[PDB]
Amino acid sequence: PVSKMRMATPLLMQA
Amino acid sequence: HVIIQAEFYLNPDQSGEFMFDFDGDEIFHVDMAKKETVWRLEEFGRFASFEAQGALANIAVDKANLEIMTKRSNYTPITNVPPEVTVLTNSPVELREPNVLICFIDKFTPPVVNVTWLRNGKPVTTGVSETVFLPREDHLFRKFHYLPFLPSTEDVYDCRVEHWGLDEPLLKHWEF
Amino acid sequence: PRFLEYSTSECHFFNGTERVRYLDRYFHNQEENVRFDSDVGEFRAVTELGRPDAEYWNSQKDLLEQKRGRVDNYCRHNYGVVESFTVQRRVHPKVTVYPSKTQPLQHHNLLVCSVSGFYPGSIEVRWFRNGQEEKTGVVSTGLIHNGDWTFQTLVMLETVPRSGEVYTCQVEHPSVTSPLTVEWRAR
Ligand SMILES: *[C@@H]1O[C@H](CO)[C@@H](O)[C@H](O)[C@H]1NC(C)=O
Ligand SMILES: *[C@@H]1O[C@H](CO)[C@@H](O)[C@H](O)[C@H]1NC(C)=O
Question: Which of B5, B62, B67, C171 qualifies as a FRET site for C164, CA 20 to 30 Å off?
């Protein structure tokens, strides 16, 4: 089982 | 130890970048065009895996937040900070054993860059290698450009770097 | 003109995975505008341009815990996934002592001791002459990232080699169980 790397996601700014 | 996930989108050039960094070293970077994770070291792919498609998802958010802020900041352009080119060698030069010329670009923005290796004036793509733009605590950028070469006594190499904020294309000579 | 937006999620491991510090930074054009600091627990705007965001993202509780779990979901996770090839990487340094100048039997000479290839950066490179630790004139370059996961360093020793003495550069690095050494007897 090849381990996976988790990516964080940048929150969207308001307009 | 510090692991940092960096990503950016340069509005004019519509260029973007997704990457992971460990103590000043790229773990990998997602190749936007091919949607494939490009590990710094091949051995890395063998121990872990990353889903490249999520990167392209994220850049979509960046591009967005980019268009927002660009407006929210009344279209202020970024101040071009010139690069600090430096040509060195992978290791000490010895005439028999082949070596690797390293052209390091440091402390600059925006990410757009234009390096070239010139062997005795003419450019040598014969072996060229490079990295994407890497982050720095002062949030400026690093970047490496390689040229495996065979130690000579008649060849003179210069790493010609170009940057928007840079009067003339600065060349950075080197020779045994 | 150009325009840039750049995000950064940071995982600060203090003493292994004992304590971790997640940081979600948002930067527009070299200016950081908002940030989620694990130690704080809530979005805080660094500049007044990034306050509309922290303000909103803070109202959304879903967004909050979302980022809050990242000290484990993402920080500690990725550490353990990569600790192998990164945190435990050890690469053999290559020591090479050599005079930067082909000087006379006795004149102002610089003895370059180039330590290359190692990883991690932590290292010691000491200069000696006939047994005494020559502290008085080292001229190092410091760590230099080569970009390919290996460092290097050139610690020179400005010394007038007397025609009848030897210089030694004893190197110590975590990847080795004993120091790598190179002796250099006056040419
Ligand atoms: C936008 O630019 C104009 C002139 O170029 C300037 O007066 C103004 O202060 C800038 N932004 C805002 C919000 O007013
Ligand atoms: C760098 O970019 C310019 C466009 O501004 C292009 O004309 C030039 O050929 C590029 N240099 C290299 C070495 O690709």
Answer: C171
